[PDB]
Amino acid sequence: GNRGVVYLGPGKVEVQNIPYPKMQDPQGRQIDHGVILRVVSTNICGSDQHMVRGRTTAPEGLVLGHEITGEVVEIGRGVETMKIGDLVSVPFNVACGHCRTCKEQHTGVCLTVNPARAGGAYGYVDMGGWVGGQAEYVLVPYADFNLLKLPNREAAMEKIRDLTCLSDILPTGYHGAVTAGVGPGSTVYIAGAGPVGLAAAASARLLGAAVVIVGDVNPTRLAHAKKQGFEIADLSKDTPLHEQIAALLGEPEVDCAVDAVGFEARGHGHSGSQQEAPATVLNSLMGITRVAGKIGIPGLYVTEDPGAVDAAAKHGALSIRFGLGWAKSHSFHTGQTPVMKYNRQLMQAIMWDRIKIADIVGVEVITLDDAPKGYGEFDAGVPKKFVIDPHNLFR
Amino acid sequence: GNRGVVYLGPGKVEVQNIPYPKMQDPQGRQIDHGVILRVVSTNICGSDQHMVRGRTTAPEGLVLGHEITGEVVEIGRGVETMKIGDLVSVPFNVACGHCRTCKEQHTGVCLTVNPARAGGAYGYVDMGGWVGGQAEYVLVPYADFNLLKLPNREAAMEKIRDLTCLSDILPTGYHGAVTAGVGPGSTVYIAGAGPVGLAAAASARLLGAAVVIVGDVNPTRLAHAKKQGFEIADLSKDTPLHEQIAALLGEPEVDCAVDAVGFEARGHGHSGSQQEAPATVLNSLMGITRVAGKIGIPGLYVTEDPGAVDAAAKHGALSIRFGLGWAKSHSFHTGQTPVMKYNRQLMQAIMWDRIKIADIVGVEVITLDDAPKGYGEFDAGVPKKFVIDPHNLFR
Amino acid sequence: GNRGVVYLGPGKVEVQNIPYPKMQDPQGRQIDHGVILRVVSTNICGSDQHMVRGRTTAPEGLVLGHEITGEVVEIGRGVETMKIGDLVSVPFNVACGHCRTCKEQHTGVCLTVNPARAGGAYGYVDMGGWVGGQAEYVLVPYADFNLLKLPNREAAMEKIRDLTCLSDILPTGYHGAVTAGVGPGSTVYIAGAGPVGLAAAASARLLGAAVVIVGDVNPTRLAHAKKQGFEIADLSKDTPLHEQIAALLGEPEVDCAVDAVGFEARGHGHSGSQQEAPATVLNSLMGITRVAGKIGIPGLYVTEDPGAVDAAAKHGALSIRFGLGWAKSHSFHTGQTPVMKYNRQLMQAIMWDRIKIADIVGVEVITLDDAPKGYGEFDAGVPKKFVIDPHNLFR
Amino acid sequence: GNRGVVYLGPGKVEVQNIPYPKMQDPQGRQIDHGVILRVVSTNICGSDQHMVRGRTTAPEGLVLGHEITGEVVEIGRGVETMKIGDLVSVPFNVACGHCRTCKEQHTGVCLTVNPARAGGAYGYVDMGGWVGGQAEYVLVPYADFNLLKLPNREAAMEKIRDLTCLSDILPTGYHGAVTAGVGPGSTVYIAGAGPVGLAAAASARLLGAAVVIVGDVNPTRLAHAKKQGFEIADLSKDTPLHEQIAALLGEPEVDCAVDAVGFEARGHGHSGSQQEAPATVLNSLMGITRVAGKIGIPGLYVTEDPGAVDAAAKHGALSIRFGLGWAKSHSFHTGQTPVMKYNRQLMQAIMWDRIKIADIVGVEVITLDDAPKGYGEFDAGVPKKFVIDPHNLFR
Ligand SMILES: NC(=O)c1ccc[n+]([C@@H]2O[C@H](COP(=O)([O-])OP(=O)(O)OC[C@H]3O[C@@H](n4cnc5c(N)ncnc54)[C@H](O)[C@@H]3O)[C@@H](O)[C@H]2O)c1
Ligand SMILES: NC(=O)c1ccc[n+]([C@@H]2O[C@H](COP(=O)([O-])OP(=O)(O)OC[C@H]3O[C@@H](n4cnc5c(N)ncnc54)[C@H](O)[C@@H]3O)[C@@H](O)[C@H]2O)c1
Ligand SMILES: NC(=O)c1ccc[n+]([C@@H]2O[C@H](COP(=O)([O-])OP(=O)(O)OC[C@H]3O[C@@H](n4cnc5c(N)ncnc54)[C@H](O)[C@@H]3O)[C@@H](O)[C@H]2O)c1
Ligand SMILES: NC(=O)c1ccc[n+]([C@@H]2O[C@H](COP(=O)([O-])OP(=O)(O)OC[C@H]3O[C@@H](n4cnc5c(N)ncnc54)[C@H](O)[C@@H]3O)[C@@H](O)[C@H]2O)c1
Ligand SMILES: [Zn+2]
Ligand SMILES: [Zn+2]
Ligand SMILES: [Zn+2]
Ligand SMILES: [Zn+2]
Ligand SMILES: [Zn+2]
Ligand SMILES: [Zn+2]
Ligand SMILES: [Zn+2]
Ligand SMILES: [Zn+2]
Numbered sequence A, B, C, D: 001g002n003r004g005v006v007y008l009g010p011g012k013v014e015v016q017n018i019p020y021p022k023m024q025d026p027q028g029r030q031i032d033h034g035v036i037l038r039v040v041s042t043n044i045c046g047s048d049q050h051m052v053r054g055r056t057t058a059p060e061g062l063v064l065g066h067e068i069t070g071e072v073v074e075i076g077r078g079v080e081t082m083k084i085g086d087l088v089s090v091p092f093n094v095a096c097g098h099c100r101t102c103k104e105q106h107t108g109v110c111l112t113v114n115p116a117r118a119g120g121a122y123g124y125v126d127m128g129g130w131v132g133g134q135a136e137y138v139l140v141p142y143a144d145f146n147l148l149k150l151p152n153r154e155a156a157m158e159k160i161r162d163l164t165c166l167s168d169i170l171p172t173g174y175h176g177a178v179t180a181g182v183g184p185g186s187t188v189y190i191a192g193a194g195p196v197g198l199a200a201a202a203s204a205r206l207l208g209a210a211v212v213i214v215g216d217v218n219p220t221r222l223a224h225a226k227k228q229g230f231e232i233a234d235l236s237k238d239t240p241l242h243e244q245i246a247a248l249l250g251e252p253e254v255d256c257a258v259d260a261v262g263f264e265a266r267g268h269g270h271s272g273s274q275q276e277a278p279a280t281v282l283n284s285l286m287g288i289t290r291v292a293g294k295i296g297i298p299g300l301y302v303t304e305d306p307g308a309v310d311a312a313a314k315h316g317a318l319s320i321r322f323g324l325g326w327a328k329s330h331s332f333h334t335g336q337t338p339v340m341k342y343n344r345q346l347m348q349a350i351m352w353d354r355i356k357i358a359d360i361v362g363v364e365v366i367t368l369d370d371a372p373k374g375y376g377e378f379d380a381g382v383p384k385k386f387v388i389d390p391h392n393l394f395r
Helices: A046-052 A153-158 A160-166 A169-179 A195-206 A219-227 A241-249 A280-288 A322-327 A343-351 A357-361 A368-379 B046-052 B153-158 B160-166 B169-179 B195-206 B219-227 B241-249 B280-288 B322-327 B343-351 B357-361 B368-379 C046-052 C153-158 C160-166 C169-179 C195-206 C219-227 C241-249 C280-288 C322-327 C343-351 C357-361 C371-379 D046-052 D153-158 D160-166 D169-179 D195-206 D219-227 D241-249 D280-288 D322-327 D343-351 D357-361 D371-379
Strands: A003-007 A013-017 A035-043 A068-075 A087-089 A137-140 A187-191 A211-216 A231-234 A254-259 A289-297 A318-320 A331-334 A363-366 A385-388 B003-009 B012-017 B035-043 B068-075 B087-090 B137-140 B187-191 B211-216 B231-234 B254-259 B289-297 B318-320 B331-334 B363-366 B385-388 C003-007 C013-017 C035-043 C068-075 C087-090 C137-140 C187-191 C211-216 C231-234 C254-259 C289-297 C318-320 C331-334 C363-366 C385-388 D003-007 D013-017 D035-043 D068-075 D087-089 D137-140 D187-191 D211-216 D231-234 D254-259 D289-297 D318-320 D331-334 D363-366 D385-388
Touching: A003 A368, A013 A368, A035 A160, A046 A368, A068 A137, A068 A160, A153 A160, A160 A169, A160 A343, A160 A357, A160 A363, A160 A385, A169 A195, A169 A254, A169 A289, A169 A343, A169 A357, A187 A195, A187 A280, A195 A211, A195 A219, A195 A254, A195 A357, A211 A219, A211 A241, A219 A231, A231 A241, A241 A280, A254 A280, A280 A289, A280 A318, A280 A322, A318 B322, A322 B318, A322 B331, A331 B322, A357 A363, A363 A368, A368 A385, B003 B368, B012 B368, B035 B087, B035 B160, B046 B368, B068 B137, B068 B160, B087 B137, B087 B153, B087 B160, B153 B160, B160 B169, B160 B343, B160 B357, B160 B363, B160 B385, B169 B195, B169 B254, B169 B289, B169 B343, B187 B195, B187 B280, B195 B211, B195 B219, B195 B254, B195 B357, B211 B219, B211 B241, B219 B231, B231 B241, B241 B280, B254 B280, B280 B289, B280 B318, B280 B322, B357 B363, B363 B368, B368 B385, C003 C371, C013 C371, C035 C087, C035 C160, C046 C371, C068 C137, C068 C160, C087 C153, C087 C160, C153 C160, C160 C169, C160 C343, C160 C357, C160 C363, C160 C385, C169 C195, C169 C254, C169 C289, C169 C343, C187 C195, C187 C280, C195 C211, C195 C219, C195 C254, C195 C357, C211 C219, C211 C241, C219 C231, C231 C241, C241 C280, C254 C280, C280 C289, C280 C318, C280 C322, C318 D322, C322 D318, C322 D331, C331 D322, C357 C363, C363 C371, C371 C385, D013 D371, D035 D160, D046 D371, D068 D137, D068 D160, D087 D153, D153 D160, D160 D169, D160 D343, D160 D357, D160 D363, D160 D385, D169 D195, D169 D254, D169 D289, D169 D343, D187 D195, D187 D280, D195 D211, D195 D219, D195 D254, D195 D357, D211 D219, D211 D241, D219 D231, D231 D241, D241 D280, D254 D280, D280 D289, D280 D318, D280 D322, D357 D363, D363 D371, D371 D385
Parallel strands: A187 A211, A187 A254, A211 A231, A254 A289, A289 A331, A363 A385, B187 B211, B187 B254, B211 B231, B254 B289, B289 B331, B363 B385, C187 C211, C187 C254, C211 C231, C254 C289, C289 C331, C363 C385, D187 D211, D187 D254, D211 D231, D254 D289, D289 D331, D363 D385
Antiparallel strands: A003 A013, A035 A068, A035 A137, A035 A385, A068 A087, A318 B318, A331 B331, B003 B012, B035 B068, B035 B137, B035 B385, B068 B087, C003 C013, C035 C068, C035 C137, C035 C385, C068 C087, C318 D318, C331 D331, D003 D013, D035 D068, D035 D137, D035 D385, D068 D087
């Protein structure tokens, strides 16, 4: 008995029966280092949206989902730290724990788990074949390495809405803020008010930023951010970002900027916001970040976009105003979040009431049968982070 | 009075009589903090070549040169640590010493010395109208802050050909290597076998790199790099860069990469290399740097190139394969070198024979009258670094 | 007309007429780089107390005070950035701005301003003879480099009780926390609930620490810390520090520990707390900081203490259980805070209401005539930070 | 079929027959993650000497040796990257690869492999009861995480004298130098011309230091250091170290200082050097390191020393002149080397002839039966590093 969300072509996902998990890798070799989880909570990601919209090279039939929190039901013979019944947060990265990059804390780019390229992840295009976890049950390989044990079940269940964000979005937003150099007193600009943008804004606040400005083209997502105490920039109005920031800060620049949009970026302005223009965020962040600043880029950029705007963009080439960044001495930091690097201290923050992440990103808890509908609302721009409770454990 | 190298329009320089330096800034306000130097040695740079070629917005009449070594002949009334006769290395950055960026060692982007933008330099486009120093005498403002005191004059003069590199190219090459993450045992690729690239190679050697490979489309420069003990990759051949690297290393990746080419980049291959393609280096570096690696970009890129290949490149926009670097978790480091942050320890290294920079870059000493001829030769691609001795002090 | 707080021997200070400041250094040479301030607010520090208790080699007649906020009334001819009437925060460190340590942001240890050793500061033993500023007027040398310009007078004056802490204690407490490695999610122990200890605790809250525990032997300072939302360890109880921490956290250790006591440390327990044992804090921090942790030590330790417990301590030797910290792989960070490294970002934090520093440290505003009484109360251990308003400008 | 070096009480070691390795931990539990090695080379360490001299709480019967290079002859059933015949470097830390410290690269203080405290190592006091490897065969647990693969056996054995240093002393010396802040152009002082000190000196050279001065009380070691091209300081002479340094550099300070002596430190001077004084090195490093400088302390300090000079030292407590370090703003870095952090890039530098470590540390190859003789000669202070070749594979 297993089931989950399956990708079936542009705009299409459905809940299907799927195989119960097996203690083997995606090439069918047996493994001793894995566990099988009964899934407690499992979220929908903006990355999942890229795939569902037909924006990647994903195969039809892909089981989706890489934001898992779970409870051990089966343990492979080599696993030392796990017991049946243990609650765990699963980092979205599949990492081996023994290669050059895993050992150097670069668990987003594991050298062994994916025959095609460095880096692995559950239910995710080009990520080594590991089955996704928007499902009733899921296999986690290298369990001793990857898993974050949650505190006593009671206190954990009590904050599950928060803890479900440790799998992907909070550590990601956090990595965005830290690589952009955010610290106490920083002025911060955040591109994107989606779940990831909002997590970067929360992270920046937690890191002690003086002021945090969140930008989007979506007015409902900005209203959400504003109700959460952040400053906003509306990129659908005709007033340029520079001008919006200056009205707020008294200069047209920030200390730190985070790109939480990626390759489906829209342009700015009345008509610009209705046009896809994937270099937009990059170019505008070079424009607003002060000299010697750092740009953090958690937003996803791909080597291949079948639906992209032009030949160059189909192959991940953007028209980027690099001379500007260079003239401003900017440095840029990119790539999949190494979730494990931050997830334990972020847990401490949640448990100690330092960060109300669930309120901030607008967590909504849904049934597994509502998942397709959840994707639909998410696609239609709702200011929410959808959390699937597939066994009805806490809803 | 004084005389020096003057730019007269695309491809034209000549030595002219010019005013003796005055104790005032480019706005004509008196300064108490400056010194006037008799110029001992003064170098020709690839940056100078960009301007001479008419590839920047540099005006006719500009006095050239930002790589100065001198002797103090006059000091302003507020200068406390400099005395007459003192022999000094001058960082190419003009920096104030008291703004936010100068305090934080970002002295390539001083916020007060330039009304146009952050950052200053001598005889350099968009760099605040500080007068160039390919000349007999030159003004250095903020002398206590900027100047590097050279060792008792005998010892200094005997290593003049080396120390003349401290003003620009050695610290610049060094910046590129350290921001690319080079250290003991690193494998390193450097694009560009011009003097800056050779300084980057020298720096990586100093740092204890396991192996250093220098790439260029100009075979006579690669011959020179090879005779200095470096590995080479010839981009004018049709053999792809990753294949030349694998033949040297046994894998197609380096740990660290440095872009010492900048915006006049040629394409790769027999015919590709005969044509300008400004994004080529950046794209190639993402291709051969290993995941989670760092890319150092000392090479110059501009916000405006009058003679660029395309409308986009005229504005500093390049077709960059960003999605590739993003998928490899690359980080990118850019901009004008903070020369002061490294010049002291590099001088130490020079004085203790840990680095034979003059040999590595191919230093050649010339008379001031020979400057126009030297620019011609350098522009034609000879494997040399031209050092002007305007008062015939050591030649 | 000038007057200040003067040190007159163990336990003794009085307010005296003193010379109006002069544009010369402590050796009587004219300087062009200084300003004179009309003092707006000027604070009493724990460092001042060491000196008043006769615990240092401070000479009788020392004019005290290194915590200055002021209004420019005079300007030396070399000064570029200052105007009469400007409101400024004065970092307690006297720094030149052009030596090796000043350039690398080590402005607590300037090489040029003190003939006796590295590092200068106002009204401070062994700190170069710069006159103190617990006075109506004071000289600030190297004004362009050292001074922090405050916001429109009106907004600045309104937050004076907060901003006055930028001269010394907030940056210091901050340096304590950052060098101890504090970050989002940290568990933090801070030794000392004095104004500096409190600033460290505030800094740790601002840095996003999960839980902050402040320890002291003083019951009244702890009741004040507890009112400000911090956890407490009462070292006057017989319950050892381990046990109090473990009761609080469920393990007898913290990620990060800051020493905000210094060389007049008391031992632990009913009677231990009435004994001086200068090694106490260092040894107990090594006991409760987890493996590979960092210990930040802002608390002052001296080369000479005329009033110490024994021979060894009079020369700054302590019996330190180094083997313990070594076995735990601890790192240690020490010395005068480089205030300029942090003050600007801290000002932004204050102006944006991210840190209510005045309330936390218990700012109390007094007249210059009440200063001796202030010293008295401070010495008796009141949980307050004394701020003198010498011209009655805001009180 | 196995034997090795067994400790029998103060001053006494002998070769005995010992059990063949079993695939279990020191508690007798079965493990699937280990491999068994035929030992190729296995070294004698100063750490071993501490124990043999009776200066630790090490038990009679302890099998010695933590510096192993070997070939895999048997693999556990869960091992994924090791094959029989594989030739490997063993880091001396026993590390699990799944706990908090292991993941953060703090593999010197693993939290799971040792019931007594954090940190594990082979045949080493308080290090988890993992059996030592000056033996014919040895167990390495967590093989996929811990082992460093060496290349074609042929190229590897030709450099075996160098390669055998990667297990312990080269990465130790390297850790000491990097944490002392050593970089291109650094001036460095290293206390101790034992093998570890010599490896720090080699490291500092590799890292590009301007000048490296090694001190010792043992002149036969200093003769060796000088022959290896380093500067020396003789601490058995009455000339104070700061004067010896000034003679060499023209100032009495260094940029970086490394303590490669540890808890059996001798005093300085004709008579001082003849007596044990365990605070001596730490105290003199604070004396000669420049302000804001960093002190690396790879030398061992213990929480309990049975034969220490006084009551306090038996407990790991030293009379440290901390006031002086504090006034100079020193940082201090301590503890067991995380060998995995550095071993990969040091192997690269060895294979590409960037460091001739075996020559520098004075490697001498001996039989297993001659081990007691090696220990004796090493204790008499010869300038050599003993490498045991148990199966006569390359001697
Ligand atoms: N590095 C990582 O680990 C990582 C992890 C998850 C997601 N991501 C990427 O981060 C992005 C965030 O996902 P999300 O969860 O935020 O999904 P999302 O797609 O809902 O959020 C993207 C937001 O960007 C907005 N936007 C579009 N153009 C914009 C512009 N010009 N300026 C500002 N905002 C603009 C969209 O309206 C949307 O609100 C996704 O692209 C995701 O792929 C990266
Ligand atoms: N960051 C700084 O502060 C700083 C300082 C000085 C110079 N620079 C910049 O560094 C760059 C180099 O200066 P230089 O004196 O070394 O320049 P240079 O003009 O002598 O040489 C540049 C080299 O790049 C080579 N090249 C062109 N396309 C190439 C490709 N695709 N691959 C490999 N090589 C290619 C050319 O053959 C040439 O040999 C210049 O652009 C200069 O403006 C920056
Ligand atoms: N590094 C710097 O730049 C710098 C700057 C300012 C102050 N300091 C030093 O920091 C310390 C803090 O200064 P302050 O203004 O808070 O002075 P303070 O003397 O009021 O603070 C010291 C506090 O520590 C308490 N204490 C004594 N023994 C203790 C122990 N074992 N554990 C915990 N607490 C103990 C005392 O009760 C007192 O409350 C002083 O030493 C000051 O000199 C250093
Ligand atoms: N950090 C680690 O993980 C690690 C690893 C290996 C060894 N160690 C420790 O490193 C130390 C040295 O390594 P080794 O094997 O070369 O040690 P060793 O004992 O062979 O040599 C120590 C040297 O220091 C000299 N010495 C003694 N007092 C001195 C003083 N006051 N000043 C200068 N030199 C003095 C001794 O004569 C001897 O030459 C030992 O303490 C060892 O326990 C630590
Ligand atoms: Zn995701
Ligand atoms: Zn891996
Ligand atoms: Zn140049
Ligand atoms: Zn400046
Ligand atoms: Zn103070
Ligand atoms: Zn200074
Ligand atoms: Zn050892
Ligand atoms: Zn471990």
